[PDB]
Amino acid sequence: TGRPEWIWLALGTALMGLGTLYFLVKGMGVSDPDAKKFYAITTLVPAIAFTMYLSMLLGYGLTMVPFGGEQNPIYWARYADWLFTTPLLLLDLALLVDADQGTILALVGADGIMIGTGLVGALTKVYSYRFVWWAISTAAMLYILYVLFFGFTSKAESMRPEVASTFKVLRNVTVVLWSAYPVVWLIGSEGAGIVPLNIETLLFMVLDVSAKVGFGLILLRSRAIFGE
Amino acid sequence: TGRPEWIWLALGTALMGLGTLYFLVKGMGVSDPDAKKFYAITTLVPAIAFTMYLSMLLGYGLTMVPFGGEQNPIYWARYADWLFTTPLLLLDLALLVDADQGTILALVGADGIMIGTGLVGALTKVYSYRFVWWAISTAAMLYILYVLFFGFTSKAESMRPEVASTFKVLRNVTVVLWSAYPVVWLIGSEGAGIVPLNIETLLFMVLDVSAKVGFGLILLRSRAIFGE
Amino acid sequence: TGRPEWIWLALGTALMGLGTLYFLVKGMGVSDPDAKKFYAITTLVPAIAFTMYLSMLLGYGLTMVPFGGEQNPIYWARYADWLFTTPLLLLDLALLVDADQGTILALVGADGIMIGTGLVGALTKVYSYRFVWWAISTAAMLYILYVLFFGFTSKAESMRPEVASTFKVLRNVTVVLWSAYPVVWLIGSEGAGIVPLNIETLLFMVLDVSAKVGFGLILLRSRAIFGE
Ligand SMILES: CC(C)CCC[C@H](C)CCC[C@H](C)CCC[C@@H](C)CCO[C@H](C)COCC[C@@H](C)CCC[C@@H](C)CCC[C@@H](C)CCCC(C)C
Ligand SMILES: CC(C)CCC[C@H](C)CCC[C@H](C)CCC[C@@H](C)CCO[C@H](C)COCC[C@@H](C)CCC[C@@H](C)CCC[C@@H](C)CCCC(C)C
Ligand SMILES: CC(C)CCC[C@H](C)CCC[C@H](C)CCC[C@@H](C)CCO[C@H](C)COCC[C@@H](C)CCC[C@@H](C)CCC[C@@H](C)CCCC(C)C
Ligand SMILES: CC(C)CCC[C@H](C)CCC[C@H](C)CCC[C@H](C)CCOC[C@@H](C)OCC[C@@H](C)CCC[C@@H](C)CCC[C@@H](C)CCCC(C)C
Ligand SMILES: CC(C)CCC[C@H](C)CCC[C@H](C)CCC[C@H](C)CCOC[C@@H](C)OCC[C@@H](C)CCC[C@@H](C)CCC[C@@H](C)CCCC(C)C
Ligand SMILES: CC(C)CCC[C@H](C)CCC[C@H](C)CCC[C@H](C)CCOC[C@@H](C)OCC[C@@H](C)CCC[C@@H](C)CCC[C@@H](C)CCCC(C)C
Ligand SMILES: CC(C)CCC[C@H](C)CCC[C@H](C)CCC[C@H](C)CCOC[C@@H](C)OCC[C@@H](C)CCC[C@@H](C)CCC[C@@H](C)CCCC(C)C
Ligand SMILES: CC(C)CCC[C@H](C)CCC[C@H](C)CCC[C@H](C)CCOC[C@@H](C)OCC[C@@H](C)CCC[C@@H](C)CCC[C@@H](C)CCCC(C)C
Ligand SMILES: CC(C)CCC[C@H](C)CCC[C@H](C)CCC[C@H](C)CCOC[C@@H](C)OCC[C@@H](C)CCC[C@@H](C)CCC[C@@H](C)CCCC(C)C
Ligand SMILES: CC(C)CCC[C@H](C)CCC[C@H](C)CCC[C@H](C)CCOC[C@H](C)OCC[C@@H](C)CCC[C@@H](C)CCC[C@@H](C)CCCC(C)C
Ligand SMILES: CC(C)CCC[C@H](C)CCC[C@H](C)CCC[C@H](C)CCOC[C@H](C)OCC[C@@H](C)CCC[C@@H](C)CCC[C@@H](C)CCCC(C)C
Ligand SMILES: CC(C)CCC[C@H](C)CCC[C@H](C)CCC[C@H](C)CCOC[C@H](C)OCC[C@@H](C)CCC[C@@H](C)CCC[C@@H](C)CCCC(C)C
Ligand SMILES: *C/C=C(C)/C=C/C=C(C)/C=C/C1=C(C)CCCC1(C)C
Ligand SMILES: *C/C=C(C)/C=C/C=C(C)/C=C/C1=C(C)CCCC1(C)C
Ligand SMILES: *C/C=C(C)/C=C/C=C(C)/C=C/C1=C(C)CCCC1(C)C
Structure with missing residues (x-):
């Protein structure tokens, strides 16, 4: 339950908060329109994570789900x-990569399904069913990764070489980190329970900070966010 | 309760899933920007419906509401x-019909109210109040239908004849199918309960598949989705 | 609990409904694209408020939260x-003020955090923690007010004088009214409980109607909504 893992939740809260502040201050020295968008998007990510990590640390974002008896x-x-x-x-x-509206909607939609089905699976009371939702969510994740390689990368190359290289790195970072989430879920408390909640929380914290703060540091330190 | 209607939920799940896959594969042979958007939007619709129909089939999307004693x-x-x-x-x-942002926001907003108030009505514990929410939701639906005829159709005519004819058909399909929803709700388990949940579920399934898969088939088979 | 404050909830419901209808009818005499957007946005605000005030009046939007024993x-x-x-x-x-996408996202994101954390605080079972969420939400509010003065006002001046003056008034109205919300929350039933729910409801009703209907009347009566 909510106790041993408190340290990882506290560390997560602190790291997300620090990341948010760093991006906030760093963005002050920016006036470029396009650069603005990247800072706005990237700073909101850890800001949101900060509030949710704090909610978990304080016990609000925790609930008890009956399953497996x-x-x-x-x-x-x-x-x-x-x-x-x-x-x-x-x-x-x-x-x-200056993706078209159609692809953005496809990505956002698939993402919504990925998280929504993950939540349904996390709260399902019938053990075997939890994995059905896991499979559907994973399929949605695979769709996203597919688009990022066969509907994005190809276009990034048709853009400035600075944008292409930064996208390639962030793309690779995303694919590696995101793919780990379903594995942690499958082996942790939400899944087969081979790994205890304490360790599961630690894993998600490392992944989250890397996928948010780490990802942001790479992006906001790049010249790709400016139109030159 | 959740038993007799299982067959309609299973059929709904299967039909939405098949529709999603068909649109997904069909969209592979498309690269046109505008055409892309229509495929992205249209494929997401049955994909979402698929997850929710499955949630109902498995019992997750079902709850007990006290009312009428x-x-x-x-x-x-x-x-x-x-x-x-x-x-x-x-x-x-x-x-x-290339509607302006203002009209899109009006439609999306009215739609949000329609569904939100429908949900409030569906979960209201005071019988008579359920119908107050039904009325408000229906008013929002009428607003939407109004805009589709006096704020859309008029413009579709000012566009390509291929777009006008496809819009007219989809518009008519939408008006007929959508208008049936409040009636089913009013006569079914959420309303006066003249029709049993089993039959209510069947009705919504026929309506949903037609409004999503049927609607999508008409749209994605049209040349109106391409700019020529 | 839900009784003495019924009159303020009923008045709020009536005033939001009347405001929505007034804006709806007033907008009928408009065809200008940009003018359309303002009417769509502004009419949706009291329409939504109307549904939620009614939900509270009928008892649906009310819940019991344990805290302070x-x-x-x-x-x-x-x-x-x-x-x-x-x-x-x-x-x-x-x-x-024709703000760029980046700033809009920043504002919407900060706003989402403000309301989300306010909700978490309102439903928190540990008394002292409620104020932690209040502080975070208030910080988000301050961010919004900051942007409205150092990221908006400065640009409004670079626009038409009609737009600048209308923005300045609405900006001032927003800052004054919005800043009152955290105070009412802090002194009311959600906070330290120095003011009874009855009075708290009255205060929010006055603020809401002013911030929505009052705000809308000023905006929709202005020539700033048209491009001339
Ligand atoms: C420190 C926090 C907690 C509170 C901050 C408020 C106080 C009053 C300080 C204000 C000064 C800022 C830190 C300056 C940075 C932003 C400037 C450059 C924007 C200017 O206008 C432009 C052009 C928009 O466009 C660009 C915005 C971009 C540079 C910043 C992106 C941040 C965005 C996504 C909003 C984050 C929301 C939080 C800050 C809300 C608080 C946190 C919550 C969780 C409680
Ligand atoms: C079969 C499913 C379950 C999983 C699919 C993933 C695996 C890896 C196969 C990938 C191949 C695809 C089926 C090819 C079709 C999409 C191509 C043309 C896009 C290319 O890039 C463009 C230009 C975007 O822009 C256009 C996108 C459009 C052609 C497709 C619209 C679909 C969109 C709304 C997303 C749907 C999300 C689901 C697929 C998520 C899974 C389902 C959930 C419920 C679990
Ligand atoms: C009176 C209500 C309850 C129900 C109204 C429906 C019935 C059928 C009457 C229809 C006539 C309207 C009142 C005319 C006004 C809108 C016209 C000018 C739009 C034309 O097209 C343009 C160009 C869009 O673009 C502009 C739209 C703008 C003029 C109006 C903005 C309103 C918008 C945000 C939607 C509000 C949604 C409610 C009306 C839904 C009902 C309320 C709920 C809570 C139940
Ligand atoms: C987006 C934006 C807002 C970023 C800015 C964030 C922030 C202001 C700066 C960054 C600094 C971090 C968040 C570090 C604080 C996190 C703590 C060390 C967590 C552990 O505390 C708990 C341990 C030691 O356990 C002790 C025993 C318990 C039961 C006591 C309860 C303590 C609890 C209420 C502290 C939470 C408050 C933190 C998260 C900061 C509030 C933010 C303000 C803006 C209000
Ligand atoms: C591009 C654009 C269009 C966006 C793309 C779509 C989008 C982003 C993604 C697709 C949507 C998801 C895949 C759907 C998942 C949502 C969940 C099933 C809802 C969770 O309910 C909640 C859980 C906790 O349920 C709890 C069960 C019980 C015990 C609680 C009882 C209370 C209940 C009756 C109230 C529920 C009210 C909600 C569900 C109404 C709408 C939900 C919204 C979040 C949509
Ligand atoms: C958007 C995208 C994802 C589309 C792709 C969808 C899909 C993969 C292809 C389309 C095929 C359909 C969905 C047909 C399957 C539906 C079933 C016949 C429903 C009835 O089963 C139940 C009856 C016979 O009752 C039996 C007794 C019960 C108690 C057993 C429980 C069975 C249950 C767990 C089956 C659900 C799994 C389905 C919906 C498919 C999973 C999708 C995967 C991607 C994970
Ligand atoms: C253009 C743009 C601006 C968009 C336009 C607006 C939008 C799209 C449409 C308008 C919004 C709707 C009409 C509002 C309806 C939302 C419901 C009243 C919320 C349902 O709560 C849920 C039900 C199940 O309630 C359950 C009751 C109890 C028993 C549960 C107790 C738990 C409770 C305290 C938690 C509730 C947390 C939620 C309500 C916080 C925000 C809700 C969001 C979904 C907005
Ligand atoms: C956005 C759009 C929709 C705007 C249009 C709104 C509307 C149609 C026009 C504006 C008029 C107002 C809303 C005035 C009505 C509000 C009431 C006086 C509230 C008090 O009633 C209750 C007191 C006297 O207590 C009596 C005892 C109780 C227990 C009886 C229950 C009464 C309750 C069910 C009335 C609510 C219905 C109202 C809000 C209007 C419905 C809108 C329709 C479109 C369905
Ligand atoms: C620009 C763009 C990206 C947008 C910017 C971001 C956005 C707009 C703002 C940021 C988001 C917020 C700050 C986050 C706050 C959301 C709440 C913590 C969720 C409330 O849960 C609800 C309360 C009532 O909890 C109730 C607790 C228990 C007792 C209920 C048990 C049921 C539970 C397990 C179901 C919860 C299902 C939800 C939380 C799934 C997703 C929530 C969404 C609303 C996101
Ligand atoms: C660790 C990271 C998230 C940073 C955490 C920062 C923390 C929250 C505080 C933020 C504010 C500080 C003052 C730091 C900002 C100062 C500098 C500009 C940072 C320099 O890095 C600048 C650079 C360019 O950026 C890139 C740095 C790398 C390390 C990011 C790569 C992310 C990711 C792919 C790493 C993999 C995951 C890790 C945890 C390893 C797991 C090992 C497994 C085998 C288990
Ligand atoms: C029934 C429909 C939803 C399709 C279901 C498909 C199913 C889910 C599987 C999807 C994948 C398949 C392999 C089919 C795709 C192959 C073709 C290109 C289809 C050809 O139709 C191609 C065409 C052009 O499209 C139009 C076809 C018509 C039938 C759509 C009209 C929708 C609607 C308005 C029908 C009315 C409602 C019905 C159910 C009748 C109710 C009667 C009342 C009196 C009760
Ligand atoms: C009170 C207000 C919300 C209006 C309520 C209207 C009501 C809901 C019905 C709506 C439909 C009606 C038929 C009115 C429309 C007709 C006119 C065009 C209105 C003329 O005002 C036209 C003008 C231009 O507009 C501006 C009018 C001012 C009064 C708006 C200023 C809002 C705000 C900043 C006021 C401060 C808060 C108040 C309540 C004082 C609190 C005092 C404290 C010391 C406690
Ligand atoms: C800051 C957080 C990030 C980048 C989170 C990413 C999360 C995912 C890629 C989550 C995926 C899941 C699945 C594929 C299946 C099981 C459910 C989830 C939610 C763990
Ligand atoms: C795929 C689903 C579609 C096209 C669903 C459409 C739903 C509506 C038009 C629903 C309307 C309702 C009312 C007008 C009043 C009562 C509540 C609803 C939600 C059944
Ligand atoms: C129609 C409603 C309007 C304009 C509402 C505005 C609300 C706020 C500015 C609310 C702010 C809050 C805080 C700053 C802290 C405590 C929680 C809130 C939600 C009351």
Whole structure:
């Protein structure tokens, strides 16, 4: 339940808060329109994560879900976080490669399904069913990764070389980090429970900070965010 | 409760899933920007419906609401579905006639009110009050239908004849199908309960598949989605 | 609990409904694209508020929250209202000064955090924690007010003098009214409880009608909404 993992929740809260402040201050020295958008998007991501990590730390974002004949602690606040932060991260990537509206909607929509079905799975009372939702959510994730490689990368090359290289790195970072989430879910408290909640929380914290703060540091330090 | 109607929920799940896959594959042979948008929007609709129909089939999207001195089974997942799919359908229509941002916001906003108030009515514990919400939701629906005829049709004519004819058909399809929803709600388990949940579920399934898959088939088979 | 304050909820419901109808009818005599957007945005605000005020009046938007060792009545419907109406009001201001996408996203995002954290605070079971959320929400509000003065006003001056003057008035109206909300929350039933729910409801009603209907009357009566 909500106790051993408190340290990872506290560290997550602190790291997201610090990241938000760093991006906020760093963005003060920016007036370029396009550069503005990237800062706005990128700063909102850890700001949201900060509030949800704090909600979990304080116990608000935690609930008990019956399944497997047991009362299992489930941090639902994560999904509220991801619901808004994952599409924002996708928007950063899309804006970078100047994706068309159609592809953006496809990505945001698939992302919404990914998080929504993940939440349904996390709160499902029938054990076996939890994995059905996991599969559907994973399929949505694969769709997103597909678009990022066969509907994005190809266009990034048709853009400025500075944009292409920054997109390629952020793209690779996204694919590696995002793909780890379903694995942690599958092995953790929400899934088969091979890994305890304490360790599951630690894993998500490392992934979240990297996917948000790490991702943001790479993007906001790049010249790709400016139109030159 | 959740049993007799299982067959309609299973059929709905299957039909939405098949529709989503068909649109997904069909869209692979498309690269045109504007055509892209229509495929993205139209494929997301049954994809979302698929997840919610499955949630109902598995029992997750079902809840018990006290009213009329009874414990009434209410499938709340429908509203989560409609909250996102109805405005997407409206966006398809709006994009088709190249509606201005102002009208799109008006439609999306009215739609949000329609579904939101429908949900409030569906979960209201005071019988007579349920119909007050039904009336407000219906008023919002009438607003939407009004705009589609006196704020859309008139412009579709000012566009390409291919767009005008496809819009006219989809418009007519929308008006006929959407108008049936409040009637089913009024006579079904959420309303006066003249029709049993089993039959109510069947009716919504026929309406949903037609309004989503049927609607999509007409749109995506049209040349109106391309700019020529 | 839900009784003495019924009159303020009924008055709020009536005033929001009347405002919505007035804006609806007033907007009929408009065909200008940009003017359209302002009417669509501005009419949706009181329309949404109307539904939520009615939900509170009927008892649906009310819930009991344990804290301070007591069962405290909390009208959660307010946050559902504000979640959608505050960013819409910000959009009116942003459209007026032709703000760039980056700033709009920053405002909408900060607003989402403001309302979200306010809701978390309103439903928190640990008394002292409620004020932590209040502080975070207030910080988000201050960010919004900052942008409206150092990221908006400066640009409004670079626009038509009619737009600048209307923005300045609406800006001032927004800053004064919005700043009162955290104070009412802090002194009312959601906070330290120095003011009874009855009076708290009255205060929010006066603020809401002014910030929505009053704000709208000023905007929609202005020539600033037209491009000339
Ligand atoms: C420190 C926090 C907690 C509170 C901040 C408010 C106080 C009053 C200080 C204000 C000064 C700022 C930190 C300056 C940075 C932003 C400037 C450059 C924007 C100027 O206008 C432009 C052109 C918009 O366009 C660009 C905006 C971009 C540079 C910043 C993106 C941030 C955005 C997504 C909003 C984040 C919202 C939080 C800050 C809300 C508070 C946090 C919550 C969780 C409580
Ligand atoms: C089969 C499903 C379950 C999983 C699919 C993922 C795997 C890896 C296969 C990938 C291949 C695709 C089916 C190819 C079709 C899309 C191509 C043309 C886009 C290319 O880029 C463009 C230009 C975007 O712009 C256009 C997109 C448009 C052609 C498709 C619209 C679909 C969109 C709304 C997203 C739907 C999301 C689901 C697919 C998510 C999974 C379902 C959930 C419920 C679990
Ligand atoms: C009176 C209400 C309850 C129901 C109204 C429906 C019936 C059928 C009457 C229709 C006539 C309207 C009142 C005319 C005004 C709108 C016209 C000018 C738009 C034309 O097209 C343009 C160019 C869009 O673009 C502009 C729209 C703008 C002039 C109006 C903005 C309103 C918008 C935000 C939607 C509000 C939604 C409510 C009306 C929904 C009902 C309320 C709920 C809470 C139940
Ligand atoms: C987006 C924007 C807002 C960014 C700015 C964030 C911020 C202001 C700067 C960054 C600094 C971090 C968040 C570091 C603080 C996190 C803590 C060390 C967490 C552990 O505390 C708890 C341990 C030691 O356990 C002790 C025992 C318990 C039961 C006591 C309860 C303590 C609790 C209420 C502290 C939370 C307050 C933090 C998160 C900051 C508030 C933000 C303000 C703006 C209001
Ligand atoms: C491009 C654009 C169009 C966007 C794309 C679509 C979008 C972004 C993604 C697609 C949407 C998701 C895949 C749908 C998942 C949503 C969940 C099933 C809703 C969770 O309900 C909640 C859980 C906790 O349920 C709890 C169960 C019980 C025990 C609680 C009882 C209370 C209940 C009756 C109230 C529910 C009110 C909600 C569901 C109404 C609408 C939900 C919205 C979040 C949509
Ligand atoms: C958007 C995108 C994802 C589209 C792709 C969808 C899909 C993969 C292709 C389309 C095919 C359909 C969905 C047909 C399957 C539906 C079933 C026949 C429903 C009835 O099963 C139940 C009956 C016979 O009752 C039996 C007794 C019960 C208690 C057993 C529980 C069975 C249940 C868990 C099956 C649901 C799984 C389906 C919906 C498919 C999963 C999708 C994957 C991607 C994970
Ligand atoms: C253009 C743009 C601006 C968009 C236009 C606006 C938009 C799209 C449409 C307008 C919005 C709707 C008409 C509002 C309806 C929302 C519902 C009243 C909220 C349902 O709450 C839920 C039900 C199930 O309530 C359950 C009651 C109890 C028993 C549950 C107790 C838990 C409770 C305290 C938590 C509620 C948390 C929510 C309501 C916070 C915000 C809600 C959001 C969905 C907005
Ligand atoms: C956006 C759009 C929709 C705007 C249009 C709104 C509207 C149609 C016009 C504006 C007029 C106002 C809303 C005035 C009505 C409000 C009432 C006086 C509130 C008090 O009633 C209650 C007192 C006296 O207590 C009596 C005892 C109780 C227990 C009886 C229950 C009465 C309750 C069900 C009335 C609510 C219905 C109102 C809000 C209008 C419905 C809108 C329709 C479109 C369906
Ligand atoms: C620019 C763009 C990207 C947008 C910017 C971001 C956005 C607009 C603002 C930022 C988001 C907020 C600050 C986050 C606050 C949301 C709340 C913490 C969620 C409330 O949950 C609800 C309360 C009542 O909780 C109730 C607690 C228990 C007792 C209920 C048990 C049921 C529970 C398990 C179901 C919860 C389902 C939800 C939370 C899933 C997602 C939530 C969405 C609303 C995001
Ligand atoms: C760790 C990271 C998230 C930063 C955390 C910062 C923290 C929250 C505080 C933020 C504010 C500070 C003052 C730092 C800002 C100052 C500098 C400009 C940072 C320099 O890095 C500047 C650069 C360019 O940026 C890139 C730095 C790299 C490390 C980002 C890569 C992200 C990701 C792909 C790393 C992989 C995941 C990790 C945790 C390893 C897991 C190992 C497994 C085998 C288990
Ligand atoms: C029934 C429909 C939803 C399709 C269901 C498909 C299903 C989910 C599987 C999807 C994938 C398949 C392989 C089909 C795709 C292949 C073709 C291109 C289809 C050809 O139709 C191609 C065409 C052009 O399209 C138009 C076809 C018509 C039938 C659509 C009209 C929708 C609507 C207005 C019908 C009315 C409602 C019905 C159910 C009748 C109710 C009667 C009342 C009196 C009760
Ligand atoms: C009170 C207001 C919200 C209007 C309520 C209207 C009501 C809901 C019905 C709507 C439909 C009606 C038929 C009115 C429309 C007709 C006219 C065009 C109105 C003329 O005002 C036209 C003009 C130009 O507009 C501006 C009028 C001013 C009064 C708006 C200023 C808003 C705000 C900043 C006022 C401060 C708050 C108040 C309540 C004082 C609190 C005092 C404290 C010390 C406690
Ligand atoms: C800041 C957070 C980030 C970048 C979060 C990413 C989350 C995902 C890619 C989550 C995916 C999931 C699945 C594929 C299946 C099971 C459910 C989820 C939600 C864990
Ligand atoms: C895929 C789903 C579609 C096209 C759904 C459409 C739903 C409506 C037009 C629903 C309308 C309702 C009312 C007018 C009043 C009562 C409540 C509703 C939600 C059934
Ligand atoms: C129609 C409603 C309007 C304009 C509402 C505005 C609301 C705010 C500015 C609310 C702010 C809050 C805080 C700053 C802190 C405590 C929580 C809130 C939600 C009361």
